[PDB]
Design a binder for this molecule. Structure first.
Ligand SMILES: COCOc1ccc(-c2nc(CC(=O)NCC(=O)O)cs2)c(Cl)c1
Length: 323
């Protein structure tokens, strides 16, 4: 009929159709299901996948390139993973493919972000286990995870490249000052600039903005003039044009669910707050996808503090923002 409510799912789009997989609610959602939303008509459609179906997961990182889907990472019932999957959505019953990649993969983690640039999928940050061996960057343990679970976890500032020409992992030699290790940040790509805003680190949910030059591997920090959005994690950051990123929702340091929306103007280096009718619908750990008609499609996520699991208000609403 319609997709069940969920948080921490993935959603990717080609501008017409939005593909939704995974997430959890109050147990993980069925791993074989793939929900497809038509951005032009508003109808959903459920299909069942086969092949090397990934385990049902929260916090995975997914992209849609040339109508083929790539999925990295996430948290399943036995923990975090660093496996890589692809799902060709061009043609026949769709088959997931686990890709045995070459090179040193990233550590097993979730709640990260990715930038697409030509043949490269570029992943940044996240939360998961200590890397099996030293990795270019820094890993910072989360104290609370030691006593809660068998395997402690922590945040990282790693940058990894999966080159789709050969499916080989590598780490670029970056210059500049990289952002601190973080998870639940939001990543967005415009041209050769890989933007990242916000995220959780230590005891803070941050408000800084940075971009990585995807042609020179140089980190730059952006300091916009005037009023800026409150620091947050579990928010969405979506390119809406060559010159504007759309920001919505999330979760403050003081654990307040957010319903504000902003546009970040790249050319002017300025934030502009966006009026919308969903002020009473804060979401965090939702997804957001841009349509070819200048809209942003938000789905799922939780309306309150999802860390109180027995009171968590997960959603299956579609919120349309006209930009
Ligand atoms: C597998 O079911 C999902 O339910 C959850 C939801 C959240 C967490 C946590 N994530 C962190 C790391 C972080 O930066 N979290 C982002 C932040 O704190 O703003 C600390 S607690 C966990 Cl383990 C399980």
């Amino acid at each position: 009929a319609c997709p069940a409510e969920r948080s921490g799912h993935v959603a990717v789009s080609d501008g017409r159709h939005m593909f939704v997989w995974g997430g959890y609610k109050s147990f993980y959602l069925p791993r074989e299901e793939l929900w497809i939303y038509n951005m032009e008509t508003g109808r959903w459609k459920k299909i069942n996948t086969e092949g090397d179906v990934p385990p049902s997961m929260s916090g995975s990182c997914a992209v849609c390139v040339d109508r083929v889907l790539y999925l990295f990472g996430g948290h399943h019932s036995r923990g975090n993973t660093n496996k890589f999957y692809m799902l060709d959505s061009r043609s026949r019953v769709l088959q997931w493919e686990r890709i045995d990649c070459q090179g040193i993969p990233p550590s097993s983690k979730d709640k990260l972000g990715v930038w697409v640039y030509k043949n490269k999928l570029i992943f940044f940050g996240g939360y998961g286990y200590l890397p099996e061996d030293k990795v270019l960057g820094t890993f910072e343990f989360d104290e609370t995870s030691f006593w809660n679970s068998s395997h402690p976890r922590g945040w990282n500032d790693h940058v990894h490249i999966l080159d789709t020409e050969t499916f080989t992992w590598s780490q670029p030699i970056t210059t500049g000052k990289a952002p601190s290790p973080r998870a639940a940040h939001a990543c967005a790509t415009v041209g050769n600039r890989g933007f990242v805003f916000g995220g959780r680190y230590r005891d803070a949910r941050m408000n800084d903005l940075h971009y990585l030059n995807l042609d020179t591997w140089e980190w730059n920090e952006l300091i916009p003039q005037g009023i800026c959005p409150v620091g947050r994690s579990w928010h969405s950051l979506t390119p809406v044009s060559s010159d504007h990123l759309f920001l919505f929702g999330g979760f403050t340091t003081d654990k307040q669910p957010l319903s504000d929306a902003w546009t970040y103007c790249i050319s002017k280096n300025e934030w502009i707050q966006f009026n919308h009718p969903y002020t009473e619908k804060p979401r965090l750990w939702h997804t957001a996808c841009a349509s070819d008609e200048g809209e942003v499609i938000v789905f799922g996520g939780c309306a309150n503090n999802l860390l109180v699991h027995h009171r968590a208000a997960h959603s299956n609403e579609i919120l349309i923002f006209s930009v």
